[PDB]
Amino acid sequence: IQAKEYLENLNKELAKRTNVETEAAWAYRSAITDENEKKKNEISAELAKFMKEVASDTTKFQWRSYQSEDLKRQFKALTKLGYAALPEDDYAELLDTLSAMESNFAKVKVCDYKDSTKCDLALDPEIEEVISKSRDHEELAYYWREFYDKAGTAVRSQFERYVELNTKAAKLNNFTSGAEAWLDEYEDDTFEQQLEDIFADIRPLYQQIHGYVRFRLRKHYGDAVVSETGPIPMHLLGNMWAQQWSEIADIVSPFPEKPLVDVSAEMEKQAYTPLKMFQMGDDFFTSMNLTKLPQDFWDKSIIEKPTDGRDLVCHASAWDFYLIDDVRIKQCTRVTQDQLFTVHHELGHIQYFLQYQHQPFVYRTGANPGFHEAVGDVLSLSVSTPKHLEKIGLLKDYVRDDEARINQLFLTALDKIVFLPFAFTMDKYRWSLFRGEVDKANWNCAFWKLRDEYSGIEPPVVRSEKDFDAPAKYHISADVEYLRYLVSFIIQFQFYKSACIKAGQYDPDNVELPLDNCDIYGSARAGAAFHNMLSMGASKPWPDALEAFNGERIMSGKAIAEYFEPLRVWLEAENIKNNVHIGWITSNKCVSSHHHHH
Ligand SMILES: C[C@H](CS)C(=O)N1CCC[C@H]1C(=O)O
Numbered sequence: 001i002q003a004k005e006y007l008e009n010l011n012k013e014l015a016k017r018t019n020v021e022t023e024a025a026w027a028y029r030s031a032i033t034d035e036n037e038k039k040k041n042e043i044s045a046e047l048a049k050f051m052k053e054v055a056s057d058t059t060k061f062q063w064r065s066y067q068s069e070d071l072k073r074q075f076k077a078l079t080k081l082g083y084a085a086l087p088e089d090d091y092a093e094l095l096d097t098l099s100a101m102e103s104n105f106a107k108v109k110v111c112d113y114k115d116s117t118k119c120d121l122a123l124d125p126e127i128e129e130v131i132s133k134s135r136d137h138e139e140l141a142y143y144w145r146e147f148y149d150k151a152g153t154a155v156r157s158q159f160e161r162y163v164e165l166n167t168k169a170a171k172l173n174n175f176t177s178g179a180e181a182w183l184d185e186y187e188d189d190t191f192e193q194q195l196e197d198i199f200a201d202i203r204p205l206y207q208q209i210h211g212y213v214r215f216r217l218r219k220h221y222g223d224a225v226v227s228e229t230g231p232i233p234m235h236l237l238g239n240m241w242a243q244q245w246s247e248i249a250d251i252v253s254p255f256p257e258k259p260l261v262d263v264s265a266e267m268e269k270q271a272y273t274p275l276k277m278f279q280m281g282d283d284f285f286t287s288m289n290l291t292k293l294p295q296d297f298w299d300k301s302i303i304e305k306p307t308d309g310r311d312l313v314c315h316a317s318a319w320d321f322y323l324i325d326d327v328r329i330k331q332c333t334r335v336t337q338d339q340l341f342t343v344h345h346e347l348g349h350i351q352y353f354l355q356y357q358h359q360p361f362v363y364r365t366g367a368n369p370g371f372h373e374a375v376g377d378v379l380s381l382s383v384s385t386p387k388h389l390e391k392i393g394l395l396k397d398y399v400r401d402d403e404a405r406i407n408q409l410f411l412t413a414l415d416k417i418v419f420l421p422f423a424f425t426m427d428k429y430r431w432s433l434f435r436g437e438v439d440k441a442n443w444n445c446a447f448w449k450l451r452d453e454y455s456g457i458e459p460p461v462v463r464s465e466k467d468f469d470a471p472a473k474y475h476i477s478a479d480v481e482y483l484r485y486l487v488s489f490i491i492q493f494q495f496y497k498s499a500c501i502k503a504g505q506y507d508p509d510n511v512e513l514p515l516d517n518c519d520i521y522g523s524a525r526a527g528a529a530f531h532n533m534l535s536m537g538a539s540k541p542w543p544d545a546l547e548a549f550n551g552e553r554i555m556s557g558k559a560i561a562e563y564f565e566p567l568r569v570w571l572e573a574e575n576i577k578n579n580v581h582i583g584w585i586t587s588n589k590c591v592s593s594h595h596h597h598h
């Protein structure tokens with residue numbers, strides 16, 4: 001019998017019913033009120049029951065024996081019930097606990113280090129600016145400590161029941177745990193190992209940047225503050241979680257003398273605005289014959305932090321309302337070079353949305369979560385190059401010295417190479433929890449030992465099992481899988497390298513056309529490749545989506561390394577010239593107790 005009629009009917013409903021859920025999720029996250037929180041959870045509970053019933057109806061159709069896939073593909077996916085598999089009581093309890101951590105994160109406020117009266121400083125604007133600009137280790141320590149105690153510790157209990165229900169829901173779907181359930185999204189039994197492999201190839205590179213940054217930081221802050229051979233004290237790497245270090249390029253770039261690609265201040269001087277930035281981002285896509293932003297986007301998107309005293313979630317995000325042309329972004333945008341990439345990052349999501357609207361709801365997602373987080377980053381890479389920044393006048397007079405090129409790759413290494421091990425630890429940690437590998441009595445150290453092993457970083461002050469820091473990371477609090485980023489930072493280079501080749505910008509043979517300097521801006525063959533891939537949306541396992549992009553079907557490290565080759569070689573020499581220590585000894589920042597009040 002034909003269920004193509006069934007599925008078509010059903011997807012159309014799901015897309016209708018998810019629309020409702022999406023408007024409540026979006027109202028909440030634009031204005032955190034209990035009422036909005038209640039409506040939001042209400043809708044999901046409702047949707048959850050529909051799914052349960054929709055799931056039992058499919059027992060009618062024995063698709064495990066059907067003929068054509070796609071159809072046979074839509075059932076395997078529509079019957080994979082996530083948290084909705086949980087009985088009524090638990091699903092609701094999960095939503096509550098899930099709401100608790102999300103709003104706790106977003107509602108954090110600390111008191112200004114030099115004015116204990118204020119206490120209205122928030123993470124997005126204020127704190128992120130301090131961690132990023134201050135050069136007083138004691139002040140960055142203050143803000144580190146103040147933020148991790150509120151954002152992580154305060155929500156340890158909820159986080160524990162979250163893992164419990166997460167696990168419960170995963171066994172309810174025939175998965176080993178929540179861990180193996182996330183991995184399933186990549187449809188490949190050897191995925192984790194492929195990633196463990198690639199990380200190994202780039203690690204050596206990671207351990208040359210590490211010792212170097214540590215060299216300057218220690219030269220700048222001093223021996224007493226940063227020690228040689230020891231892991232790098234966070235709070236000093238310019239990022240609350242140390243996932244990216246570009247913010248401290250003013251003190252660790254090898255050539256601050258040679259032009260620094262810091263368009264950030266030339267932006268502010270030119271009166272750049274959030275709106276202008278989105279429009280610039282709209283341009284790149286249309287330049288590539290990609291789809292232009294629809295009218296609902298400019299009408300509904302929130303692109304600047306609301307000015308009232310209301311609470312909201314401001315960790316940038318893009319929304320697919322599952323209709324036709326109703327896509328919106330919510331960003332607390334600021335005029336700075338990092339935010340500029342972010343806009344593009346977000347538009348990468350929007351693009352994908354538009355690219356697969358026609359697809360049956362079930363397939364309206366990304367081929368492999370990795371693909372979703374990479375689109376917009378590929379354009380960002382182009383925008384970051386001297387070529388494209390001069391072309392738009394955000395870099396007046398610039399000379400490609402040679403040692404100016406080193407900066408152009410080094411400033412990129414702090415966000416792209418450096419990130420690889422951070423994102424890997426994020427899920428390795430949550431995987432070890434989902435799997436019963438760790439004892440609740442060691443939950444907070446496993447996280448730090450893990451930040452130690454892979455990143456060589458440690459907290460500003462001693463923490464203990466009394467604290468719980470993992471939740472200080474938005475995604476841990478909001479339950480958002482993180483492996484998608486690791487995969488993105490790898491393959492986004494695979495995309496970029498092919499785009500530039502299809503575009504007349506990259507030639508491996510001769511020079512004058514180096515990978516780190518193509519712009520693909522205005523490239524039609526590029527957007528073309530980007531259309532064959534995006535338009536598919538989950539309709540096929542990812543090896544097929546990629547193959548639609550460049551004929552290849554494998555994920556590899558042959559992209560970042562080739563891109564950062566000139567940097568890697570420049571460092572080895574430099575590290576011997578300065579006698580720079582490589583590698584680090586285990587950390588002494590995870591313990592338990594100890595006070596001097598007798
Ligand atoms: C806003 C995006 C997701 S749409 C995000 O969370 N990113 C982008 C890069 C890293 C990571 C982060 O902020 O931790």
Ligand SMILES: [Zn+2]
Pocket residue numbers: 345349372373
């Ligand atoms: Zn994203």
